[PDB]
Enzyme design. Structure first.
Site, PDB file in Angstrom:
ATOM      1  N   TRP A 196       0.867  -1.175   0.000  1.00  0.00           N
ATOM      2  CA  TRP A 196       0.000   0.000   0.000  1.00  0.00           C
ATOM      3  C   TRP A 196       0.903   1.223   0.000  1.00  0.00           C
ATOM      4  O   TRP A 196       1.484   1.571   1.030  1.00  0.00           O
ATOM      5  CB  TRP A 196      -0.910   0.026   1.231  1.00  0.00           C
ATOM      6  CG  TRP A 196      -1.744   1.287   1.340  1.00  0.00           C
ATOM      7  CD1 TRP A 196      -1.382   2.467   1.935  1.00  0.00           C
ATOM      8  CD2 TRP A 196      -3.052   1.507   0.783  1.00  0.00           C
ATOM      9  NE1 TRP A 196      -2.379   3.404   1.783  1.00  0.00           N
ATOM     10  CE2 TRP A 196      -3.415   2.842   1.083  1.00  0.00           C
ATOM     11  CE3 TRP A 196      -3.950   0.705   0.065  1.00  0.00           C
ATOM     12  CZ2 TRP A 196      -4.637   3.396   0.678  1.00  0.00           C
ATOM     13  CZ3 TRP A 196      -5.167   1.258  -0.336  1.00  0.00           C
ATOM     14  CH2 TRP A 196      -5.497   2.590  -0.023  1.00  0.00           C
ATOM     15  N   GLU A 220       7.972  -2.121   1.224  1.00  0.00           N
ATOM     16  CA  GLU A 220       7.864  -1.662   2.609  1.00  0.00           C
ATOM     17  C   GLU A 220       8.723  -2.657   3.420  1.00  0.00           C
ATOM     18  O   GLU A 220       8.742  -3.855   3.109  1.00  0.00           O
ATOM     19  CB  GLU A 220       6.408  -1.743   3.099  1.00  0.00           C
ATOM     20  CG  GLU A 220       5.374  -1.034   2.236  1.00  0.00           C
ATOM     21  CD  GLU A 220       3.947  -1.197   2.769  1.00  0.00           C
ATOM     22  OE1 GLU A 220       3.544  -0.455   3.693  1.00  0.00           O
ATOM     23  OE2 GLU A 220       3.225  -2.083   2.263  1.00  0.00           O
ATOM     24  N   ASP A 225      10.041   1.988   1.118  1.00  0.00           N
ATOM     25  CA  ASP A 225       8.973   2.883   1.520  1.00  0.00           C
ATOM     26  C   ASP A 225       8.772   2.722   3.017  1.00  0.00           C
ATOM     27  O   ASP A 225       8.045   1.834   3.461  1.00  0.00           O
ATOM     28  CB  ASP A 225       7.686   2.515   0.782  1.00  0.00           C
ATOM     29  CG  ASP A 225       6.508   3.368   1.199  1.00  0.00           C
ATOM     30  OD1 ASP A 225       6.608   4.094   2.208  1.00  0.00           O
ATOM     31  OD2 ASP A 225       5.466   3.304   0.521  1.00  0.00           O
ATOM     32  N   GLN A 240       5.429   4.037   7.267  1.00  0.00           N
ATOM     33  CA  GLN A 240       4.844   3.602   8.538  1.00  0.00           C
ATOM     34  C   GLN A 240       5.851   2.941   9.462  1.00  0.00           C
ATOM     35  O   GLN A 240       5.625   2.829  10.670  1.00  0.00           O
ATOM     36  CB  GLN A 240       3.693   2.630   8.304  1.00  0.00           C
ATOM     37  CG  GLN A 240       2.371   3.302   8.115  1.00  0.00           C
ATOM     38  CD  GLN A 240       1.231   2.326   8.087  1.00  0.00           C
ATOM     39  OE1 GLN A 240       1.035   1.572   9.032  1.00  0.00           O
ATOM     40  NE2 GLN A 240       0.466   2.331   7.003  1.00  0.00           N
ATOM     41  N   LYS A 271       4.195   9.323   7.142  1.00  0.00           N
ATOM     42  CA  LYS A 271       3.372   9.153   8.353  1.00  0.00           C
ATOM     43  C   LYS A 271       4.016   9.498   9.688  1.00  0.00           C
ATOM     44  O   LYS A 271       3.530  10.371  10.402  1.00  0.00           O
ATOM     45  CB  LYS A 271       2.790   7.728   8.450  1.00  0.00           C
ATOM     46  CG  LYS A 271       1.444   7.549   7.741  1.00  0.00           C
ATOM     47  CD  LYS A 271       0.945   6.106   7.845  1.00  0.00           C
ATOM     48  CE  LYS A 271      -0.211   5.802   6.877  1.00  0.00           C
ATOM     49  NZ  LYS A 271       0.110   6.041   5.436  1.00  0.00           N
ATOM     50  N   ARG A 286      -3.851  -4.474  13.591  1.00  0.00           N
ATOM     51  CA  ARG A 286      -2.610  -3.746  13.487  1.00  0.00           C
ATOM     52  C   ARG A 286      -2.557  -2.936  14.763  1.00  0.00           C
ATOM     53  O   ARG A 286      -3.342  -2.008  14.957  1.00  0.00           O
ATOM     54  CB  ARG A 286      -2.611  -2.839  12.257  1.00  0.00           C
ATOM     55  CG  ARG A 286      -2.785  -3.597  10.941  1.00  0.00           C
ATOM     56  CD  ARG A 286      -2.490  -2.707   9.740  1.00  0.00           C
ATOM     57  NE  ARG A 286      -3.355  -1.531   9.707  1.00  0.00           N
ATOM     58  CZ  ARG A 286      -3.137  -0.460   8.948  1.00  0.00           C
ATOM     59  NH1 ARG A 286      -2.075  -0.414   8.156  1.00  0.00           N
ATOM     60  NH2 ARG A 286      -3.984   0.560   8.987  1.00  0.00           N
TER      61      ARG A 286
HETATM   62  C1  LIG Z   1      -0.012   5.113   4.563  1.00  0.00           C
HETATM   63  C2  LIG Z   1       1.105   4.879   3.570  1.00  0.00           C
HETATM   64  C3  LIG Z   1       1.295   5.684   2.383  1.00  0.00           C
HETATM   65  C4  LIG Z   1       0.395   6.861   1.983  1.00  0.00           C
HETATM   66  O1  LIG Z   1       0.561   8.072   2.725  1.00  0.00           O
HETATM   67  P1  LIG Z   1      -0.481   9.145   2.235  1.00  0.00           P
HETATM   68  O2  LIG Z   1      -0.274  10.436   3.062  1.00  0.00           O
HETATM   69  O3  LIG Z   1      -1.932   8.616   2.459  1.00  0.00           O
HETATM   70  O4  LIG Z   1      -0.270   9.453   0.723  1.00  0.00           O
HETATM   71  C5  LIG Z   1       2.378   5.368   1.536  1.00  0.00           C
HETATM   72  N1  LIG Z   1       3.205   4.336   1.806  1.00  0.00           N
HETATM   73  C6  LIG Z   1       3.054   3.557   2.902  1.00  0.00           C
HETATM   74  C7  LIG Z   1       4.003   2.421   3.149  1.00  0.00           C
HETATM   75  C8  LIG Z   1       1.999   3.798   3.810  1.00  0.00           C
HETATM   76  O5  LIG Z   1       1.854   2.994   4.934  1.00  0.00           O
END
Ligand SMILES: *Cc1c(COP(=O)(O)O)cnc(C)c1O
Ligand SMILES: [Ca+2]
Ligand code: NA
Length: 431
Positions: free
Chosen positions: A136, A208, A241, A244, A270, A404
């Site tokens: 995601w 991720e 990425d 989170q 985040k 989670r």
């Molecule tokens: C939540 C998330 C995003 C998106 O962040 P947004 O501010 O909603 O664009 C991107 N990458 C990861 C791994 C995330 O957990």
């Protein structure tokens, strides 16, 4: 009271439903690890807002820096440099694995993944992007095409050159070699397939460190390194990425630091904004220069805005100063065990995985069968809310419901316990 008739009248009247169901309350205040409704009932936030508030809600240090800047430096023309911007960028270079030297400041992860992907394409001449089946990376284009977690069905074709390989899921191993889960061979297999489909334009692989939206799936030992070699073998850029997982949530300032594998481009959001829209990407000096030579461009309204940069730099200071990365491991191990205890009492708990303060718990109809629990997960999240403990459960196919659990990195030993207790009761009355 929460019932305020004129409030919900307006809610159903003028609110666009973006998927999901709205909690039947009214949050009027939030502090540390709690949010309060109209009646003042305290609710333990085991989701750090939206995996953001790592420093808890309305953390005084953040409240301080915000006011302090909203009145002195707020928004600038993208072409004007300030001090919060240069220091935040500098800090990021300094606390990230050697190699990551230059940063770009944005507002969102989707935005940050967009930036990294476009840069990887530009410095490679290639345009094919590969990711995980359950990842995601936002709701935005280039970042949403590499998101096979959700949001790709019923909205027209995907983005040209998007490939997804399976993610190594140790709890539910589906690739076997010699009566064992050879998740590394599973990687070659996946890649060989990708190579046959590729038109020879693989620009990068995005991943991720811990697939959050995909059910808290942690990348096993040696995987990351293997993934890296696979990219290097194909002239691909590896992009981690850490939207989170970055900023100490998993016990390391950056989850990639644990595998010892440095990405070509790292993306944050985040946990860097701590409930405030701030994001960024960091890449090597060489990559930045090359991209610059090819006229790399990526303008945003808030690119290099002093205020967001200031809050972000202050978030970092709080994490280091108050050693919250360590805090994540201590409170995490405490939370992890409390979970294993509950797993020792209830059979519906099939697995407890994750890391630091980013844990997941999969609910199964039977631990031996590993058969997903029908709505049982939802039932417990519902019971958890009544009990005053806010939870979040993701339901993916072929997988059971997954909770989670992510308290703030500023969560107290007692708050961890309180949560554990509430959760246990939630399961008891849920069965
Ligand atoms: C939540 C998330 C995003 C998106 O962040 P947004 O501010 O909603 O664009 C991107 N990458 C990861 C791994 C995330 O957990
Ligand atoms: Ca700007
Ligand atoms: Na660095």
């Amino acid at each position: 009271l929460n019932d305020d008739a004129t409030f919900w009248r307006n809610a159903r009247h003028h609110l666009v439903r973006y998927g999901g169901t709205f909690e039947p309350m009214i949050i009027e205040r939030a502090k540390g690890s709690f949010v309060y409704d109209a009646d003042g009932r305290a609710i333990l936030d085991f989701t750090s807002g939206q995996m953001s508030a790592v420093l808890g809600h309305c953390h005084p240090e953040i409240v301080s820096v915000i006011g302090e800047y909203a009145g002195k430096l707020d928004h600038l023309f993208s072409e004007m440099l300030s001090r919060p911007v240069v220091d935040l960028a500098t800090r990021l270079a300094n606390i990230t694995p050697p190699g990551l030297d230059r940063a770009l400041l944005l507002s969102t992860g989707a935005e940050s993944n967009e930036a990294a992907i476009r840069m990887a394409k530009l410095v490679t001449g290639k345009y094919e992007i590969v990711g995980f089946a359950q990842s995601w990376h936002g709701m935005t284009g280039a970042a949403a095409s590499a998101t096979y977690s959700a949001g790709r069905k019923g909205v027209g074709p995907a983005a040209v050159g998007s490939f997804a390989i399976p993610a190594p899921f140790t709890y539910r191993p589906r690739f076997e070699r010699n009566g064992a889960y050879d998740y590394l061979a599973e990687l070659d297999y996946a890649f060989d397939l990708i190579d046959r489909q590729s038109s020879g334009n693989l620009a990068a692989f995005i991943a991720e460190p811990i697939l959050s939206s995909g059910g808290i799936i942690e990348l096993p030992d040696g995987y990351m390194a293997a993934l890296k070699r696979k990219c290097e073998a194909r002239g691909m850029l590896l992009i981690l990425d850490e939207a989170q997982t970055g900023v100490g949530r998993t016990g390391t300032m950056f989850a990639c630091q644990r595998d010892g594998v440095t990405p070509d481009i790292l993306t944050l959001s985040k946990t860097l904004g701590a409930g405030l829209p701030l994001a960024a990407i960091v890449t090597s000096a060489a990559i930045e220069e090359r991209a610059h030579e090819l006229g790399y461009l990526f303008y945003t309204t808030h690119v290099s805005d002093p205020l967001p940069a200031a809050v972000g730099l202050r978030v970092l200071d709080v994490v280091q100063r108050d050693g919250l990365v360590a805090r994540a491991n201590v409170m995490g191990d405490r939370l992890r065990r409390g979970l294993l205890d509950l797993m020792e009492r209830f059979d519906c708990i099939g697995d407890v995985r994750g890391r630091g303060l980013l844990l997941g718990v999969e609910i199964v109809k039977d631990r031996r069968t590993k058969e997903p629990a029908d709505g049982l997960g939802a039932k417990i999240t519902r019971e958890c809310m009544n009990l005053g403990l806010s939870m979040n459960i993701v339901q993916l196919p072929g997988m059971g419901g997954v909770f989670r659990i992510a308290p703030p990195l500023t969560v107290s030993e007692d708050e961890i316990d309180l949560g554990l207790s509430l959760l246990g009761q939630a399961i008891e009355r849920a069965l």
